[model samples]
Target: AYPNWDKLLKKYNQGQLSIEDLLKIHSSTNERVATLNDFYTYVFGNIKHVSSILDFGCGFNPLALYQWNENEKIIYHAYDIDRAEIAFLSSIIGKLKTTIKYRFLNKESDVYKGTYDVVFLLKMLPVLKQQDVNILDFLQLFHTQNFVISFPIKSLSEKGMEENYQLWFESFTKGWIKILDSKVIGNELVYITSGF
Candidate 1:
């Protein structure tokens, strides 16, 4: 049986969850909370408007809804290759009956046909590339108003990852896309691009 997110969240809310229990719910939820919070704040602050969001390669982090669109009617479509992560998120959304929807991203799964106001590719391109997927081809499938992509700074070589991502972004956005805004948030370089 899957872990019950409602009980886990209830425990967290009541200040009764131990470290072990917290990690069991979502392995990196506690460890990545601060970074995810900062990342969301930076992305949301820069974008002009947003009503729907696509959290590509969404991995266990669903705090954006609570942090940014708690009271608003927002469609949060999250996709991930990890089946466990998808099931966990699906359970949480089912229990809460919120606006969040999640899907398992795989070869058999159909690509999402809907458009979104914001598409988040947070530290996902490199991971996809590592898995033999073409980052540019995957990105081309997205239909979004604002696209936020980020790359990690620390890797095998210092600044190498950043430089490569810089070149990739420049080459990808040569004629069609334009940079709306960008910044280095901690260890991640964030680029907010627009398709107009």
Candidate 2:
């Protein structure tokens, strides 16, 4: 833990930084506070010995990794477009019990190579679709045995079919991956996958 984020947590514990303020670096993360108890646990719950991870489009989500005190030690490969966020997260990840292997994602030469136990795609797909990108193209990039993917349900949407994220995940990942288990936590419809 580097002094910056480490001090932030210290302030949080000292009643200075509200949990909201602590996580507010990104809106998606800020909105995730309500279900913090059940977020990462419910997905990787059954799996043990998860030694490595690839966090795609990680945003400030890497900060959330601190929530569970996860794993014995980890080779955390975090990818995002923002260079400053990556550098900032490096400070936070370094504050963990171990060390960091963070990456700045430029789709070309910098792609990571090492195998990972799980790849996280939290709230990742829909945003790509907005730019008319294929979700499969992104899914193919990760080299991992398992994956945790989720789509966000609108917090203010009407009650009708607001729960179709399972279907959405199923549709895109149908032939490429197998869904292992799923749960709804806050706006996140989380799915754990067994690689195809």
Candidate 3:
């Protein structure tokens, strides 16, 4: 018997859930993808030259790293907190990413503090409860010239804490970061770009 939805996800990684079963929860879509693409184009247009990128909490969809126009020149660092989840996810995604020059790091490994062109942090921050404060500290883990932080308009689950996005940005960023722009796209997604 499964413990809960979260536990079941791991079991799904162990081949407990068939593809059809996984689709029941995975079929949903997030409207933020277009918004993210627009933001990427905006940043890339501003900075023509990029060598590497770090995709944190990439989950099953490592293809997100290749969405940019970097081609083979880009080095992608993909990591997640869940290895079992990624094992199953990668099996489903196939080996196309490896052929494209992206490197998948140890799931438990810490992301390099390299000066990447961009750090994509999506749909992972607000859900943190006690760690929300630590989120500010961990933000430094993504050491890129530009940082793109995105949060769903509303918490997808009941675990997220109440946070004032504007206030959080102002307090956390202070003078260290400058907001390039922000967009409210889809039904409930907010994408913000900041530079240090």
Worst 10 residues of 3 by lDDT: 23-32
| Root mean square deviation (Cα) for candidate 3 | 5.8
Clashing pairs in 2: 1-94, 1-95
Clashes of each: 0, 2, 0
Q: How many angstroms is residue 47 displaced in model 2 relative to the true structure, after the best TM-score fit?
A: 3.0
What shift in Å separates residue 96 of candidate 1 from its native position after superposition? 3.8
Best by lDDT: 2
Tens-digit lDDT track of model 2 for 1-196 = 2236556656765778653475775777877777876886685584566778888788777777666454447767778776656766665556555343444454533554668888887888777777798777767766788888888877562545445666766876777887778878887788888763
Q: How well is each residue in 1-196 modelled by candidate 1, as lDDT tens digits?
A: 5676667767755778643344445433444454655766777788876778887877665643443334555577777776665765565455544444444344324545778898877778777777998766677787788788887665543433344777787786677778878887766788999863
Return the top candidate by TM-score. 2
Off by over 4 Å in 1: 1-32, 35-37, 67-69, 97-109, 155-163
lDDT of 2: 0.70
Identify the superior model by TM-score, candidate 2 or candidate 3.
2
